Curated annotation (Swiss-Prot), chain A:
Assigned keywords, A-Z: Cytoplasm, Nucleus, Ribonucleoprotein, Ribosomal protein
Family affiliation: Belongs to the universal ribosomal protein uL10 family.
Gene Ontology BP annotations: nuclear-transcribed mRNA catabolic process; ribosomal large subunit assembly; rRNA processing
GO CC annotations, alphabetized: cytoplasm; nucleolus; preribosome, large subunit precursor; ribosome
Subunit-structure text: Associates with the pre-60S ribosomal particle.
Subcellular location: Nucleus, Nucleolus; Cytoplasm
A Pfam match: Ribosomal_L10
Functional note: Component of the ribosome assembly machinery. Nuclear paralog of the ribosomal protein P0, it binds pre-60S subunits at an early stage of assembly in the nucleolus, and is replaced by P0 in cytoplasmic pre-60S subunits and mature 80S ribosomes.
This protein's name: Large ribosomal subunit protein uL10
Domain of life per record: Eukaryota
InterPro entries named in the record: Mrt4, Ribosomal_uL10, Ribosomal_uL10-like_insert, Ribosomal_uL10-like_insert_sf, Ribosomal_uL10-like_sf, Ribosome_Assembly_uL10
Molecular functions per Gene Ontology: RNA binding
Organism this protein belongs to: Chaetomium thermophilum (strain DSM 1495 / CBS 144.50 / IMI 039719)
RNA sequence: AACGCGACGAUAACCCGCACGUAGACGUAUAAGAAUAGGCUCCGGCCUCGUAUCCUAGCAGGCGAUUCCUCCGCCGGCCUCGAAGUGGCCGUCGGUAAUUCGCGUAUUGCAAAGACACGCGCGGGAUCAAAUCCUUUGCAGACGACUUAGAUGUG
RNA sequence: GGGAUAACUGGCUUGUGGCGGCCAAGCGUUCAUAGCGACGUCGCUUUUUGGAUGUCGGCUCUUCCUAUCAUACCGAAGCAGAAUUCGGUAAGCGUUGGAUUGUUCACCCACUAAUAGGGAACGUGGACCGUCGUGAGACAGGUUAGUCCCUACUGAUGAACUCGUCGCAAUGGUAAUUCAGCUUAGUACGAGAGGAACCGCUGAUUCAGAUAAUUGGUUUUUG
RNA sequence: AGCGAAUGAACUUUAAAUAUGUAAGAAGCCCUUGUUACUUAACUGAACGUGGGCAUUCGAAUGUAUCGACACUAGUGGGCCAUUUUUGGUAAGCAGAACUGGCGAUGCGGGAUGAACCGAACGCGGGGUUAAGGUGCCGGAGUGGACGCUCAUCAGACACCACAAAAGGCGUUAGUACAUCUUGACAGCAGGACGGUGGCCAUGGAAGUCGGAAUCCGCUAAGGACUGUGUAACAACUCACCUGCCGAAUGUACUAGCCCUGAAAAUGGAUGGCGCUCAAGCGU
RNA sequence: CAUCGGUUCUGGCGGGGGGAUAAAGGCCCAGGGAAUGUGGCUCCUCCGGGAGUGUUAUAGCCCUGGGUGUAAUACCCUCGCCGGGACCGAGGACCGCGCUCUGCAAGGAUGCUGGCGUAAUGGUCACCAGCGACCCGUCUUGAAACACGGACCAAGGAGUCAA
């Protein structure tokens, strides 16, 4: 009848990918199964996934896939009766969540060593546990909120002032300078965005992202690997720890 | 289409006392008691499990199930008020004339009164009477900031809107004259 | 409100005469409030239904018993009722089938002008308490109308 | 000279042009092509340098409408302030002149908060008989056509409800308007120039109801 | 209708509807035979004479308060409205013909009321049943029954439309055609939203986002030489799009009903009034 | 008031016929099938409550055919019986048609009882009450609408007489 949302048409070139994209994903995984030998399965639970591109560029040799877990798992073949190769059903039962596949032609031990050595600093995702009581001084709020020494720190922008005020900082932009309390300083007390042990929420995570404060560690947890010749999957550490269905 | 039946569920925590006699939802908690009459809508209340209240309509319309949804939300807000309570951190800004705010417990009627002076230099003193049950304090952590704490979300929000509306600029360019008292934070006491 | 209402003050009772006795009774009986996605309660339980309750017998309702202390009614006292005003309790007195009788009812035929008392009345008479007319006043007046003052006195 | 219509409008009136093409959902003779066809756009009016008004009026008064000039209220604007513009809620309030003209408006200038628009049955105080002419007309020729009653309302009285005093209030009407000065303040704001508003106080205009202490005026008080 | 019949509204085997002309015996028919003043080549026609048959179905149905003729005797000789058909015209009005009906000379019930509407016609009475129209009250008769729709800041109310439009409605209900959907649909939350590359021309300076053109490739799960915010330029945010969490219908355009607006001035008044909201409104 | 005659309104009852010789339905018989899956089994935040499974088990259901069966009942048509109510009694020797025939409900109301004279029943006037209801004549028009005449009462007052 009536009383419904006014659907906002999107005046933009990019469109839905859809059924064609999904069947393209089946085709890609199914055709890339045969060439490679070690199909690793890995997890990235609650880390931002910018650096997957960098690890792609590093392991240019290998081929990596990451989509719908269900889509990829059934492209592999969940049921053993409809299965591309023996043991791939085991790989499917490993595939549960924030999970990616890694076709490789080279040494699994070297793969494990490199992925153990892989480690990057990152801005924290929502839901994690904060390790520090990071705060901003009562004086002028700078670009990073005081993490680097203020003498070598540029002030943060009046453009970002409204966002900080919206996300909760009692900050005021006086004389063109954004400051928590008084322009000279003192006056106020301070603003602690997050505390030690506190479960970081979306608000605090956006605060760290705006103030360029990193408190998460991008690392990939290899659940397991399947060999083509043997046709079996060997779980390692994260494989047994991470629940699967 | 005249839906035969529809239900919604409201979970209650372990530390409350909820009672609906006819339609007077009275919820009792650590901070106090909140009572609201819901006699204007047709709903059937029951206790569907140990700690979830089921509110239902039988032979009702889409408007009626919409009423069920909104009354569910109001009851949930009462539960939240009696468990955690509501806090409104209010901020005031000035350019050249510092605004003076004074809060006083008028003992008769037992109510807060907030007086605002030197708002853009007007000699008038804006006195606002405060909602019953909610408390006002001058925050010491931050400057030019007040705290409005209470149990009733409706009362605290209406009072904050009353302040933000009484402190309103007339016949001046809003782009230049930025003075006023504004809402900053809305959350729970805990 | 000149045909809406209230409170109060002050009156009109006697003598003689003479004139008549329902826009709808027939058991014209019945006080919680409040809600209707709740309520009542005796706290056991109860609620579609006032399709209920009360009352309901005697010559248009007698007489005498039998026998009952149950209701009804009248007056007093105590209090109570004010939204356009009353009921309860107690006491006196009168009546009173709950029970059970004997006396009378008729031929009014098979349904369709007497006396007394009480009031409302008028015709005169004299009785209060007043109003108006008259005179005066002039805070008033087209004319009516209105404010006063005239019976012993701050006239 | 004959014929015909007795006469007009009455859910009529307002703010957005016409012609042609392009596009066009639908419908259609059988299908968007027998063809009809809104909104837009294009071409013409329409682009390269900034007086119209004939009979009329003129004044006052009552009432009503708003399609609101001002007062009140807010929404928007490079709205710094001040001064403004547009929009809407609003009819309680008030809504003045001069020039010019046959006369009105336009325009023009003076006050003023402002000089807004209307309705009230558009509210109350000649044509033939002819005669003389037919390339056009005239006629001192005629026939001549041609209107004090009722009652609402108000005021003052008023019969009966025994006379008088003190009251209640259903109902009906209903009233206040605008400007100015001091303080805020030469402050907020502003490069300068300039320049507010709230609170509080004091006046003035108009309207309304009163009154003669004091000041003018009036003298069948004939003092 | 057919054209597996021919041919091609102008096609037709057949054949409508629909009103509209003529005939349905005894006073009628047929032919035979003759005359003629007429006519024709000619009883060829016309009239005049013969003949016959068939009177108890004399040649369909229904109706039957009769019809024909002559003579004589009064009053009248207007139109108005509407249905249908038809002709012309306008922006719309309208104008002209023919039929029929009604009023004209007609009372009565209903539409609150009435020249043009519906039913029905008339002596005086009693009883019964109906039509149009009604059954909340005025008002006699149902707050009758069944299924649904509608809440109007002057709804609507029974036999009618203009305003009016492919008109605006985040009112409500039914329905149609398409599209996604555990291969996880729409919405939401946590994120990613890259690289060549500050792409080419231009210029104080313009880096996806003041301007003209092109708008490609890698990575892809996806990411546009970019949808807005923003900077002097950056930056940064955000959009498209894509993955994680949740889990079951949706969402795009239309049709149909009921409702709002779709235009309104001036004395106070109208579904007749009161009033009515699971109606006392609307459809059956 | 009883028995009747005519018209009429309104209730109940005994039958007959027809459908698909109603369809259904009860009870059986036989075959088949299914879930909004009965019992049972397994899992299952256990007063409880779900999920899967599997065709009658500790419930049942649907489809088809047969018997009871010419079943009953609804609907329509039809043969009759009884009850309550309203309005009227027209004509006045016999005749006729008939019947249930010693007379009858058959060409029209009688029988019984009671009331009625200081009043049964009426009349006029006045008023109230329900419903209805424009002021007459003339004249015009299709019709209205205008217009003409009407202060009242009594008497007079207008198609007559000749050839």
């Amino acid at each position: 009848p009536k009383s419904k949302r006014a659907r906002v048409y999107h005046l933009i070139q990019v469109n839905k990918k859809g059924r064609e994209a999904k069947e393209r994903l089946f085709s890609n995984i199914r055709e890339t199964i045969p060439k490679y030998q070690h199909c690793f399965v890995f997890s990235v639970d609650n880390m931002r996934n910018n650096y997957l591109k960098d690890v792609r560029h590093e392991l240019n040799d290998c081929r990596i896939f990451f989509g719908k877990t269900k889509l990829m798992a059934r492209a592999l073949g969940t049921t053993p009766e409809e299965e591309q190769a023996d043991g791939l059903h085991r790989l499917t039962r490993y595939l549960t969540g924030t999970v990616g596949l890694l076709f490789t032609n080279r040494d699994p031990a070297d793969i494990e060593s490199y992925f153990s050595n892989l480690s990057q600093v990152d801005f924290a995702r929502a839901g994690t546990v904060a390790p520090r009581t990071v705060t901003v001084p009562t004086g002028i709020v700078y670009s990073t909120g005081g993490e680097v020494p203020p003498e070598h720190d540029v002030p943060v922008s009046h453009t970002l002032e409204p966002e900080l005020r919206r996300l909760g900082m009692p900050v005021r932009m006086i004389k063109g300078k954004v400051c928590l309390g008084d322009e000279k300083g003192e006056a106020s007390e301070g603003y602690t965005i997050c505390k030690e042990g506190e479960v970081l929420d979306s608000r605090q995570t956006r605060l760290l992202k705006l103030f360029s404060i990193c408190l998460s560690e991008f690392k990939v947890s290899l659940l397991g690997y399947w060999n083509s010749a043997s046709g079996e999957v060997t779980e390692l550490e994260a494989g047994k720890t991470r629940p699967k269905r | 289409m005249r839906y035969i039946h529809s239900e919604e569920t409201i979970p209650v925590p372990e530390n409350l006392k909820v009672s609906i006699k006819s339609r007077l939802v009275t919820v009792e908690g650590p901070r106090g008691k909140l009572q609201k009459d819901l006699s204007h809508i047709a709903v059937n209340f029951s206790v569907v499990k140990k700690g979830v209240i089921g509110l239902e309509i039988h032979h009702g319309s889409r408007k009626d199930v919409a009423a069920l949804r909104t009354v569910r939300t109001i009851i949930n807000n009462m539960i939240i008020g009696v468990t955690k309570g509501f806090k409104y951190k209010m901020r005031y800004v000035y350019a050249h004339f510092p605004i003076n705010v004074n809060v006083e417990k008028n003992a008769e009627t037992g109510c807060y009164e907030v007086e605002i002076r030197n708002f853009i230099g007007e000699k008038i003193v804006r006195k606002v009477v405060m909602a019953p049950g909610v408390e006002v304090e001058i925050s010491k952590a931050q400057k030019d900031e007040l705290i409005l704490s209470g149990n009733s979300l409706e009362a605290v929000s209406q009072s904050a809107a009353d302040i933000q509306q009484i402190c309103k600029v007339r016949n001046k360019d809003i782009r230049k004259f930025l003075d006023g008292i504004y809402v900053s934070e809305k959350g729970n006491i805990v």
